[PDB]
Design a protein around this ligand. Structure first.
Ligand code: HEM
Ligand code: HEM
Ligand code: HEM
Ligand code: HEM
Lengths: 141, 146, 141, 146
């Protein structure tokens, strides 16, 4: 469960993403596919070598889907219900993979936004990613 | 543990640039902040009350070095990791009953710390290789639980 | 996050828990302490002996804290602030221990209220305890 | 692992009363219900869109009973669990790629079914004994991962 300070950090740091949204989401996914190859089995219909325009694209999609949640933070079950329906009923994504992407995002963020990736911020982003992780892997229709 | 030769060169190159003096501290430090329950294990350390507190503590920072050397230890010869950490396994498992999930968390916060210090130099291929390493080290630390 | 159905289930399974809240909370604690000995270190001051009055009484406290959680299933972070402070701020309890007690609570309920312990309800109680576990291990201040 | 001689008798008296036709199936069925993502590994199985469908699904019943079979061999080989499940391990780990946390989940769901069948007979000490067994089996199935 997020504190007020946590929502504050998440919107202040994620807000530094901006135009780079697409790039970061893309990179985070790339990091997951290379670091944790089993996660590629959720993406058979994807071209997955470096520079796939598709991974780049469904990189902006996560990043923006993520953009979704930072402002509707107080109610993601609502804002993300389509995304839950997708991840929890269709694909049945094992929660472990959410922790992997989450970790990969923290890495992408720590590599690109150093002045921003403070320990307190790090803590808040992990919770945030954990909480959107719970939303997307639960069937609550 | 099976890194490719190019992965091995890549991690060795990067480890060579690590500040074996602070990153250990930043690794342990972030663990205590990001998973605050791990502070239970360090009460003899002092003021872990605030992020700035934990972060800026000669205690958390002294200990970190130990941690880093254990990793460098592991980095050196990556074909017998079970052996090198055997004592630390007993220590953590048998003595301190540290839940092994915690070991993976620290390895991952280390990856975070490395990405922090190297930015664009911490590429996806290089991370992928450190993930094999921290995974290797974690599984060895938790072996006495086996 | 819980569904409508899940919500009514925690209510309808826990409705059958009599004034046996004491017995069951106690039995869950006893099951945790014997099955997972490391849990004992969170209670060095307690008498953890077979038949421990103190444990039976703590069973009661756990079971009534759970009661209150049922009572505000939609406002847990609100209703549970004091205990978060206790478990997350003071005690610093490793979340794995909540998985262990949750499991033992499930076994206990399975053992005593088999009629209620259907697959669908089991599913719901598990989500319910994880959610109270998340509330109890999170710093939300 | 080492159960005590006491624990050994009690698990080997409760087990002799298991309905080797329902328990397995009840455990797996519950796994697919309580943790729905496991449904992904049973595509060839059929209808699993409701709890009711799952438990009465003949494939779930049948495979579930193969599972109990595997636990049965486990209880008979408490000494080297690691080798008894060596083939099942490669199967789940290298061919199946099932995340090992899921082995722990099945194990615990199996304990729940035991509580459910045996009520008060499934005492806390009997459970404690069974938790050691399920942990052991889990760690054997995840052995080809380390
Ligand atoms: C925070 C985590 C995630 C977020 C925010 C997220 C967000 C999204 C979004 C916005 C889509 C849109 C796809 C579409 O529009 O069709 C999507 C689809 C998808 N996700 Fe994720 N997703 C996440 C995690 C994951 C994880 C961990 C996996 C598995 C490793 C996964 C596998 C997939 C797959 C297979 C699709 C369908 C792609 C398509 O058919 O377009 N997702 N997600
Ligand atoms: C994950 C990789 C880890 C490595 C490489 C590592 C390494 C070490 C080393 C070298 C020591 C020195 C102990 C001695 O020489 O007596 C130590 C001690 C210790 N570790 Fe770790 N450790 C790890 C994980 C953890 C985790 C996750 C925790 C707790 C959350 C933990 C808690 C402790 C404690 C409480 C001590 C003893 C502190 C003292 O001397 O007072 N360790 N570890
Ligand atoms: C759902 C999980 C839990 C609930 C609902 C719960 C409920 C409670 C309640 C009602 C108290 C009363 C404190 C007081 O007397 O004012 C308490 C205290 C405590 N809990 Fe928990 N507890 C839970 C889980 C755990 C776990 C998993 C652990 C450790 C393994 C733990 C360790 C403690 C300790 C050490 C206390 C101090 C009790 C005292 O000094 O009175 N708790 N809890
Ligand atoms: C203690 C834990 C477990 C035991 C003892 C066990 C046992 C078995 C056994 C005996 C088989 C038969 C393989 C064959 O037909 O040759 C099997 C296969 C299989 N297991 Fe499990 N298993 C466990 C955990 C899991 C879990 C947690 C999952 C998924 C979440 C899983 C997914 C599968 C699948 C998909 C198959 C093959 C099914 C098929 O043939 O279509 N297993 N396992």
């Amino acid at each position: 469960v997020l504190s007020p300070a946590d929502k504050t950090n998440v919107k202040a740091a994620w807000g530094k993403v901006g135009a780079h949204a697409g790039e970061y989401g893309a990179e985070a996914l790339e990091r997951m596919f290379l670091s944790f190859p089993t996660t590629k089995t959720y993406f058979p219909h994807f071209d997955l070598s470096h520079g796939s325009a598709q991974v780049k694209g469904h990189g902006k999609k996560v990043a923006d889907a993520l953009t979704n949640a930072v402002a509707h933070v107080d109610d993601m079950p609502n804002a993300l219900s389509a995304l839950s329906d997708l991840h929890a009923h269709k694909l049945r994504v094992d929660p472990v993979n959410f922790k992997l992407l989450s970790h990969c995002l923290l890495v992408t963020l720590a590599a690109h936004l150093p002045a921003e990736f403070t320990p307190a911020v790090h803590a808040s982003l992990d919770k945030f990613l954990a909480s959107v992780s719970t939303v997307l892997t639960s069937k609550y229709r | 543990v099976h890194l490719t030769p190019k992965e091995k060169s890549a991690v060795t190159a990067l480890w060579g640039k690590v500040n074996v003096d602070e990153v250990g501290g930043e690794a342990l430090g972030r663990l205590l902040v990001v998973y605050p329950w791990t502070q239970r294990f360090f009460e003899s350390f002092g003021d872990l009350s605030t992020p700035d507190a934990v972060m800026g503590n000669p205690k958390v920072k002294a200990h970190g070095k130990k941690v880093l050397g254990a990793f460098s230890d592991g980095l050196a010869h990556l074909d017998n990791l079970k052996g090198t950490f055997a004592t630390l396994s007993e220590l953590h498992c048998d003595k301190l009953h540290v839940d092994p999930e915690n070991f993976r968390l620290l390895g991952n916060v280390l990856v975070c710390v490395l990405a922090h210090h190297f930015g664009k130099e911490f590429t996806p291929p290089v991370q992928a290789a450190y993930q094999k390493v921290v995974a290797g080290v974690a599984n060895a630390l938790a072996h006495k639980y086996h």
